[PDB]
């Protein structure tokens, strides 16, 4: 992860300033004090990691299948903020109902019309979800959606008899997105739930529709009912005008909980005692969740005081209900007093004692497996696919990699990072102004990386403060999100951690007084100077929640550490396919190492390449595999880079040798710890496969001439680790384990201290 | 081992000088060239390490069970030089024949005498061993030798029928002294050939006199022969008036191998053609070993010119014979091309490719087992004793040192030393003027450590060149033998690696023009500046060795690299006892560490100790241990106080920075490596049983308080390493693999670097 | 309830315990290793109840 320092973040990880949220313009502690409560429902955010996969006109309809994907599409990321996609699905829902056609078209495509009407249609009813594909001339869509949901009702089972099929099953999927909120995520959310009310009667009508109907007769003749069957849903499509505005609600009630919680007696500020009870948000203002949600909100908006309420009804009223408590999100309106359960802890002490390092981890513990990829590409030849994943790369890499899986239990990395602990003087007298309070156990690695954000430069924007903001629409908010997400993350962890706490202000600007944060009594240390906490009130008492949590102690996990992942085995023969797309794809990618002995450069050429057991290429596939386990690998690399960083600077700035010792010292406990992983994870198996392998290619290259032909002084006190790095490598790359790319970080350590061997073999 | 050095070995290992033996007076290299041919029986010294234990006064008699330990007293140091056993022992046989006493005596103890001669002596010959103690009166005997040794005749097997008994065996032993000889050690030797002449006739008087005696009758009656039966032996006493001076025959013998190979055609050199053939040394001119002899004799003597001989007989005659030829060695004349089996090698090479690191190590694999001690002190309360082991400390704590044997799988530990290899550049480009040239594979460590000598302080020595020499005869000594035999041991080593060579003058002084040394070719390597032989004439052409070995190629061992050791199960159970003492002793010393967390000081207190599963003290017991498993240890300590030495000087010395990374990495290559074997030695298993068992002691120092109750923060990030090194310790003393002592030095690398775990755990 | 503790268990249930069950109070503690071997494969009957 990333570490500070006692005094700082604000140098090096600013988006740990809640003042940011706040809007303290980067430096001022929170200086007010004058709070009040503050408490819990511990409150809002995802659970956790959830992976699932998608059925899609299976026939048996209901709103609840999709909205998921609806709320996952933009999950999916679809093509852009959710709202888009209930507002685009909306709007072919819009070019509306001129189309009786569909109808009149179904009802034509009621065999073909009622025209003869007669007690008549008995049959085919998957060619059209296949055909509401034909549908496609009324309206358009590569968005399939429609085009694939558009089918769902008309098949909803109805003709619930004449016909007949369906009698099957498509898919969809989901891989884990947050396990906290954002508000704008808050609004799409709502924007969900919307799509979700539309749905039932729509469920309902043709559901009522068919059963009312066919009074009958077996079929009820024609001609029928399904000319209104369709006829529902335009009608539901007017049947929205509009319900509220979800950004209206959403805004409204982040200011009303600014409120409910504010320090401000005035009144953008009078929550009531005529509707404070009143159920709704009640059980929500003790929420810190979305307290953390206003702070930012509020930044971002301030408040947007249309006052949408009355102070009785409404403000009674569109805060009476709210998205979270319904339910096409796979956030879950938080437990009340877990958290999010994952920690141990150690901290500081050379006798002293006191902290500047921390000991917060990874609770982490990944997948046992990955995926093959081929799309089935064959049936319908489009995105309908099935990768007909079989025994082939899958199995061996993964239990290879399988020790790959091994070299991350992270608390063991947590370990060793955790192990450092003396230098700096003992026991005793290690510590010196600066500080280390370090962190994570999986989600906001997991958000990003497989979001191909590559959290690093985001990171680095964190820590600098303010934030790098070149970005894309999609750049730019992949870094919002990251950073909102990640903090909060922490928050509800660091808000969880002790319960006082106190609504600040801040003050700042006005900028309309909203702006407001939070601090807490922690007792137990001696007075070490920990910022400015220490504590000098019994307890930590610093509205900076790194420095609430730090200034306290050890635990253990509760967490599972779960990788999690998706088995469709049973789809894995099922299907057909949902809008699945990043596999990785084609299996893997060269890499190979050339040896120098008796001087003769070769470069054996193994790649990247099988080296699995079977020739070759293969063909055909790729694991779109497990971001955790590239996550957890992630982690360990961030490791590496930051203590680089930090080291080079100073060794330029201090200018004593005693201060280069310590300068080996972090650089090459990064230098040495990749080292000695690279050896670890080379000798993985099959890796020492790509030993003898590359090895003989390099043999060849060992034994291309006569005189080379005696084949190794290769063999030297170097070799078995130099090929054993082309073990390294090898565990390396396209295990897929990791990307690739960072080969060269790896290699910046090892460069950085000889490493040798050191010693083996 | 020691490490030089391409140009020196001259500043830290004058002892290599060939010139010191030639007497060179500390500098010039050998100039003159000018010289004849070297060659082969490969020749003198001792096989390698053999044990034996010993029967006395079997009664069954004969030269050549004793001798050996007369030989072996020596060796056994037994009081000083052979020459005084055979010495002393002629001198009881010298207070000689005027005791036809104990003829008389015998006679008179032939019961109680014939006096009533008649046919009767039946019975009673164990406690007549036991009794020619009774002839103590006659002869003193504190040296038991004749004590014990007066026996054997007097009851050879004679009377060879009444009586009767014996029908009992005693002890000798023999542990390992010299894979080499000395010349000096050649005079004793000889002394003990004359021993060993002197006994036959002596065996073969009683043996032939009473098998002719009685003629009988059953018992030839009496008065009877043993009262020549003993008269023999003193008239054997006469016998010896004196062979021949050994002394003056091995110094003429001397004289006559320089001249044997003398550069010199004038004549303290006049090598016939009348005697060069004679059988005699002809086949041991060719011998080098005799040659090492002679140049050391020569530097002592210069050469001792008495010209016993004649040029023809004799110079035909005194030199007839030789002790060597002559069998109460542990000595035997050499094979002839195998010298001494036992190198693998590799050399240095930074590409260029040239070396100054050297890969010539121990051939070593030590003892699976080691000795319980209880002198059965009961029977008869004196020497007479039984150790009377039993499975006790031995069995158990050998298994868990069997690990222990395992550390030192000595190839490995030069596997260590010779993986160092890029440092200094690469790969190129490492090397820097200065060399290092290294060795020994076990008999030169297995020759002192037994010895008490504690090779180091010789050792030191030996590398300032000039000897430290405040030594006593005993002492200075040791110091002479170890220094003389090492080189030599080497040599024949050194001999034997390359077969071209050239006896040398030097010139010098005069002296005698007797100083003379040795050089040859070997061709091989490109011009890597190798002293002043690279080679400039094909061959390395350097009459000193360590350059004329180490300008060569890499090999394997031929040899056992057994521990050997003695097993006496039989004589387990067997005996009665010889002249044993040694044991070690008392089963071990007590050693304990104390740990600090919370900060409360302790000291667990186990020792040394029974560790072992009973106690306790336990008692009694100790085991004077096979030094090579000692031996093995001894030459890691021996690393590590090497390279810590030169790194201080040249820190001093060398004020840059650069020059301060090479040097932390070889004194912390010595501060890792020790570092990391004291962490594998301690997991050993009891050891780890020393951190169950030391930290429950600590445990009530982790738990005496009530405050300090709860038990530990004593585990940290140190602790695991810290009460792990309590296994260090556990492991480090009264195993008595290691007496101790070294400790410190252990301490001085784990002091000199953090070290710190360095991880783990 | 009398009983033992695995080290004490010669330590002091040692008399019941059958290490003792020889001679062998002894030196060590019977054991190490050793030569022929095998199981009998039987004791008789069961005797037990069967009033």
């Known amino acids: 992860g990333f570490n500070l320092k006692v005094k700082d973040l604000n140098g090096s990880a600013r988006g740990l300033t809640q003042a940011f949220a706040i809007g303290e313009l980067k430096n001022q502690l929170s200086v007010g004090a004058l709070q009040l409560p503050l408490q819990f429902t511990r409150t809002f955010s995802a659970s956790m990691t959830s992976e699932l996969l998608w059925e899609v006109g299976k026939g048996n309809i209901d709103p609840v299948m999709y909205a998921r994907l609806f709320f996952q599409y933009a999950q999916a990321g679809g093509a852009l903020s959710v709202d ?78 004449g016909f007949i099929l369906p009698d099957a099953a498509y898919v969809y999927r989901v891989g884990r997105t947050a396990t906290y909120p954002n508000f704008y995520a808050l609004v799409d959310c709502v924007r969900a739930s919307d799509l979700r009310r539309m749905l039932t009667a729509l469920s309902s009508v043709d559901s009522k529709m068919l059963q009312a109907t066919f009074k009958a007769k077996g079929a009820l003749a024609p001609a029928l009912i399904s000319q209104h069957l369709a006829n529902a849903a335009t ?22 909980l600014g409120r409910l919680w504010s320090p401000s007696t005035p009144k953008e500020l009078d929550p009531s005692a005529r509707l404070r009870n009143t159920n709704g948000i009640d059980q929500l203002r003790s929420n810190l969740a979305l307290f953390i949600a206003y702070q930012d909100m509020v930044k971002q908006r301030g408040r947007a005081e ?25 956030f879950k309106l938080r437990p009340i007093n877990e958290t999010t359960s994952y920690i141990g802890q150690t901290s500081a002490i050379d006798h002293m004692g006191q902290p500047s390092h921390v000991v917060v981890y990874e609770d982490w513990q990944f997948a046992k497996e990955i995926t093959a990829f081929t799309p089935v590409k064959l049936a319908n030849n489009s995105n309908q696919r099935f990768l007909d994943v079989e025994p082939g790369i899958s199995d061996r890499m993964s239990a290879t990699l399988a020790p790959i899986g091994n070299t991350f ?69 992949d870094l919002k999100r990251s950073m909102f997400n990640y903090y909060a993350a922490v928050m509800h962890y660091a808000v969880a951690h002790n319960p006082e706490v106190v609504v600040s202000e801040h003050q700042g600007v006005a900028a309309e007084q909203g702006s407001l944060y939070l601090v807490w009594n922690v007792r137990t240390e001696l007075r070490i100077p920990v910022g400015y906490n220490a504590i000098e009130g019994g307890s930590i008492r610093t509205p900076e929640p790194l420095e609430a949590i730090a200034y306290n102690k ?35 990618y060269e890499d190979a190492y050339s040896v120098t002995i008796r001087n003769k450069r070769y470069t ?22 497990p971001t955790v386990a590239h996550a957890i690998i992630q982690m360990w690399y961030s490791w590496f880079v930051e203590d680089d960083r930090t080291l080079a600077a100073a060794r330029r700035t201090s200018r004593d040798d005693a201060e ?14 990749l080292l000695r992983k690279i050896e670890m994870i080379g000798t993985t198996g099959i890796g020492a496969s790509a030993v003898h392998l590359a090895q003989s290619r390099i043999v060849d290259q060992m034994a291309g001439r006569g005189l080379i032909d005696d084949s190794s002084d290769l063999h030297v006190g170097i070799n078995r680790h130099r090929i054993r790095i082309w073990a390294g490598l090898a565990v390396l790359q396209m295990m897929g384990l990791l990307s690739r790319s960072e080969a060269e970080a790896l290699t910046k350590v090892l460069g950085d201290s000889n490493a040798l061997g050191m010693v083996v073999a």
Chains 1, 2 share one sequence.
Request: charged share 20%; net charge negative.
């Open 235 to 256: 009608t539901a499509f007017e049947r929205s005008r509009g319900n509220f505005d979800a950004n209206a609600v959403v805004s409204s009630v982040l200011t009303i």
């Open 660 to 673: 280069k010792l310590a300068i080996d010292g972090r650089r090459m406990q990064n230098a040495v710890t």
């Open 306 to 330: 249309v006052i949408f309420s009355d102070e009785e009804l409404s403000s009674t009223i569109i805060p009476w209900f709210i998205e979270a408590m319904s339910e096409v999100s796979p």
């Open 604 to 625: 054996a050429e193994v790649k990247e390449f099988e080296l699995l057991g079977l020739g070759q290429r293969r063909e055909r596939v790729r694991i779109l595999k």
């Open 554 to 588: 050890p635990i253990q996990p509760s967490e599972v550490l779960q990788a999690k992942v998706l088995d469709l085995a049973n789809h894995t023969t099922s299907i057909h396919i949902w809008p699945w797309h990043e596999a990785s794809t084609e299996f893997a």
């Open 84 to 161: 888009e996609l209930v507002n685009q699905f909306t709007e072919y829902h819009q070019s509306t109902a001129c189309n009786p056609e569909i109808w009149r078209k179904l009802t034509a495509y009621i065999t073909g019309s009622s025209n003869r009407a007669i007690k008549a249609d008995a049959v085919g009813k998957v060619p059209p979800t296949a055909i509401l594909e034909q549908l496609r001339t009324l309206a358009p869509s590569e968005h399939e959606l429609f085009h694939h949901i558009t089918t769902d009702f008309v098949c909803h089972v109805l003709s619930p008899l």
């Open 409 to 477: 239990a992270v608390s063991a990395f947590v370990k060793n990072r955790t192990a450092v602990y003396e230098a700096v003087s003992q026991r005793g007298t290690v510590n010196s102004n600066g500080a280390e309070m370090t962190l994570g156990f999986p989600s906001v690695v997991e958000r990003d990386y497989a979001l191909d954000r590559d959290p690093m430069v985001a990171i680095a924007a964190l820590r600098t403060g303010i934030v790098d903001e070149s970005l894309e629409a999609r750049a730019s908010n």
